[PDB]
Amino acid sequence: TERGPIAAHRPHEVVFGKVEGEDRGANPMDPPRRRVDPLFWLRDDNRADPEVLAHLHLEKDYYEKRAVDIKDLAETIYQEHISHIEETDMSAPYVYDRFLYYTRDVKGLSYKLHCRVPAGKTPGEGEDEEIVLDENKLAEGKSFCVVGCVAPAPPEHALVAYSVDYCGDEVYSIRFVRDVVADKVEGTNGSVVWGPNAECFFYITKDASKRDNKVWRHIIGQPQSEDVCLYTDDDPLFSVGVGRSGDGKTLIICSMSSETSESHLLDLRKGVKHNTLEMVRPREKGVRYTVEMHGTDTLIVLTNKDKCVNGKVVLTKRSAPTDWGTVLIPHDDKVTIDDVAVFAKFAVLSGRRDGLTRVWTVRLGPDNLFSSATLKELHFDEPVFTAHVVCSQMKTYDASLLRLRYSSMTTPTVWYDEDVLSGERKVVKARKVGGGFESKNYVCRRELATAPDGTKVPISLVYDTSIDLKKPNPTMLYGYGSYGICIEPEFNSRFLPYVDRGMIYAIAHVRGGGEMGRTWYEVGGKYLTKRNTFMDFIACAEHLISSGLTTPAQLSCEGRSAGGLLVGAVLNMRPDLFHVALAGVPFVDVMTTMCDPSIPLTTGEWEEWGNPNEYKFFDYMNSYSPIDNVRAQDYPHLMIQAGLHDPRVAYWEPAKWASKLRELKTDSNEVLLKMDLESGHFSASDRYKYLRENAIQQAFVLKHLNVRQLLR
Numbered sequence: 001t002e003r004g005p006i007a008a009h010r011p012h013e014v015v016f017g018k019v020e021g022e023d024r025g026a027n028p029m030d031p032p033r034r035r036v037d038p039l040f041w042l043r044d045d046n047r048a049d050p051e052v053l054a055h056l057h058l059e060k061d062y063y064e065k066r067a068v069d070i071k072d073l074a075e076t077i078y079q080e081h082i083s084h085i086e087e088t089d090m091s092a093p094y095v096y097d098r099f100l101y102y103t104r105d106v107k108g109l110s111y112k113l114h115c116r117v118p119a120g121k122t123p124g125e126g127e128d129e130e131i132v133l134d135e136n137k138l139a140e141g142k143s144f145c146v147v148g149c150v151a152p153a154p155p156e157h158a159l160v161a162y163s164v165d166y167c168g169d170e171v172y173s174i175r176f177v178r179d180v181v182a183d184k185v186e187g188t189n190g191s192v193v194w195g196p197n198a199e200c201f202f203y204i205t206k207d208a209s210k211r212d213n214k215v216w217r218h219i220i221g222q223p224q225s226e227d228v229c230l231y232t233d234d235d236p237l238f239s240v241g242v243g244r245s246g247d248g249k250t251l252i253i254c255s256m257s258s259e260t261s262e263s264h265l266l267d268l269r270k271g272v273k274h275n276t277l278e279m280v281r282p283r284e285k286g287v288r289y290t291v292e293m294h295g296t297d298t299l300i301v302l303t304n305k306d307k308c309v310n311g312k313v314v315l316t317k318r319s320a321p322t323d324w325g326t327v328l329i330p331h332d333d334k335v336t337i338d339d340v341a342v343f344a345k346f347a348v349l350s351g352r353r354d355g356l357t358r359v360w361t362v363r364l365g366p367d368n369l370f371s372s373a374t375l376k377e378l379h380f381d382e383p384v385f386t387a388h389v390v391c392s393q394m395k396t397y398d399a400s401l402l403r404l405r406y407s408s409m410t411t412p413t414v415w416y417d418e419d420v421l422s423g424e425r426k427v428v429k430a431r432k433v434g435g436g437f438e439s440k441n442y443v444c445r446r447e448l449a450t451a452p453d454g455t456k457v458p459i460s461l462v463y464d465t466s467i468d469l470k471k472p473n474p475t476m477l478y479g480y481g482s483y484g485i486c487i488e489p490e491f492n493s494r495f496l497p498y499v500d501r502g503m504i505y506a507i508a509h510v511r512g513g514g515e516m517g518r519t520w521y522e523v524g525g526k527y528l529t530k531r532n533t534f535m536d537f538i539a540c541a542e543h544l545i546s547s548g549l550t551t552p553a554q555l556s557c558e559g560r561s562a563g564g565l566l567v568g569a570v571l572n573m574r575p576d577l578f579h580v581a582l583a584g585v586p587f588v589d590v591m592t593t594m595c596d597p598s599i600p601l602t603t604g605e606w607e608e609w610g611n612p613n614e615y616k617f618f619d620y621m622n623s624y625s626p627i628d629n630v631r632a633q634d635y636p637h638l639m640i641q642a643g644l645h646d647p648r649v650a651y652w653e654p655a656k657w658a659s660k661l662r663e664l665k666t667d668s669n670e671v672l673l674k675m676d677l678e679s680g681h682f683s684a685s686d687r688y689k690y691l692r693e694n695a696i697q698q699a700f701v702l703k704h705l706n707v708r709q710l711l712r
Helices: 050-067 068-082 135-139 495-499 518-522 531-546 561-574 590-594 600-609 618-624 652-664 688-705
Strands: 013-016 033-034 095-098 099-105 113-118 130-134 146-152 161-167 172-176 185-188 200-206 214-218 228-232 241-244 249-258 263-269 289-292 298-303 312-317 326-328 333-343 347-352 355-364 386-389 401-408 411-419 425-428 442-450 454-463 477-478 504-508 556-562 582-583 637-643 671-676
Touching: 013 590, 050 068, 050 652, 050 671, 068 401, 068 688, 113 135, 130 135, 130 146, 130 161, 135 326, 135 671, 185 200, 241 454, 249 289, 263 289, 289 333, 298 333, 298 590, 312 333, 347 386, 355 386, 442 531, 442 652, 454 495, 454 531, 477 531, 495 504, 495 688, 504 531, 504 688, 531 556, 531 561, 556 561, 556 688, 561 582, 637 652, 637 688, 652 671, 671 688
Parallel strands: 214 241, 477 504, 477 556, 556 582, 582 637, 637 671
Antiparallel strands: 013 033, 095 099, 099 113, 113 130, 146 161, 161 172, 172 185, 200 214, 214 228, 241 249, 249 263, 289 298, 298 312, 312 326, 333 347, 347 355, 386 401, 401 411, 411 425, 442 454, 454 504
């Protein structure tokens, strides 16, 4: 009896293929195809059409009427999110020459404070603390302000450089902490790399389309007009970067594209007038590499070369740097190596293996050469987690300690120092989580689903340890995965309102994401294999059901943005698997949007999903496009969040989708559309806002699953 809004049909036709005067791609169908979209009119580029507005106000009214009984729970949940944030905080301090550096956040203030304490003292507010740079002071009276970099000049740290942008154009000027020197450097990308003894520093300028194209040396006490430019790459596929070797003796200059690199070395021992670069390996298309210096004579190179898609690490001499015959760490199908950092006594590798983030360590042999047999992987007790080396906090080249960051669905982020040789760990900073959180109450684990083609898909799940595992329990299954993003099983206080009410909270690491490495995205779920994203997700839900963890009556799912594509297709395919669902700013008008280059992101996104103006993609994309596959079947309760002026998805997509669902669905569940009408074109996010949206959706799920009350 009590149906939500259904929009009147207005015949309109959408054309796919070649259209005079429009850039529809390099190979559009000729002649083109036409299909009817009777709800096309809900789109207004202007966001102001009165008939469109009257319709969305019907949606506002139906939403309000229907959220009456979840308002108080939403507010409880919001209170929970609030209590999880520490407005007063200090970061993990780290040695940097004769100081301990750290950041602080203060209760009433928007920006951080960059602080320092002498070598032997206790980090924190007090007589000992020296406030190096207070961003609130820079920010004062300004509408936009972002610091790119705070950069103390090594040995002494008497000059500290910093970069600031007050414009929002991502161009930064470089200034000095309380004008110790007068020098000012304009037109930079925000980064600052010191040369030795505070004599000079290095910076990068841009040209067309704000592309980083030149590396410069600025000598302190000189006008910028005299800066020497060391390097230029004006190939528009390439961007430049500059870094400093760990021992501080060598500058590393590089050009990078999405698939090709090139590095050059500059000797910093030769003074401010020596500008001649040393070529590492010339540019070769499809060959990626990164260079790190072990001392001054040897390079450790992480590369793609010779089909090592997952990376190999190579050891070469400065005097013959194109000879990459010596493999320190061979390629391995199982292991992904994303980077290396080198120190005097060991190198540290980062990447993934078996779906998780990993860190590896390699030491010196008894002979001062790096040694393969030394390779170890840092091990953890829990089955799913996140772990990273934090080399922004490793400022001392001859260290024995690693600085590490661990986080898990059980464990708020912990920073610790670990001994490279023994493996002894010492806590530096463990995150505080308020509102009664304690780690011992929770357990996380790994499950493996099996897709139709036989491929194993990992799931990370967490729950409160007091639930009855001898029966099935209310569950939330989250999925993204496009663009090769990994949805990490890291700590996230935002699932606590679920988990604290008896729910199992689960992530499906489906193809399209990047969790299993290189090919999990690029062959696994992209272009004409994209359907794997949805089939994998379903396989995860079925595994959770066949193993006894849940049942369809007690299962929920959610995705946001490109993850909204996932929920949309999955609800057409297997809505029987889910009692209630969420879809934030969901990408659901796939065909009608992807055909049309007038819509802002369309053109770029051809390189993700494909171009339905082309024969190659028309039917395939049409097979999963959510709006296009809505039909007369039972769907679960659903809540859609979107925004009139939100740039994550054009407002009309979720509006068309909700109208269509209500028009054809055969069930009597509710589809709610929470549509922000008030935020404007330039409105900034704001974070308390995101928590308010999170809270009402979570209240929705919790109502429908019948788990309103806290467990403890």
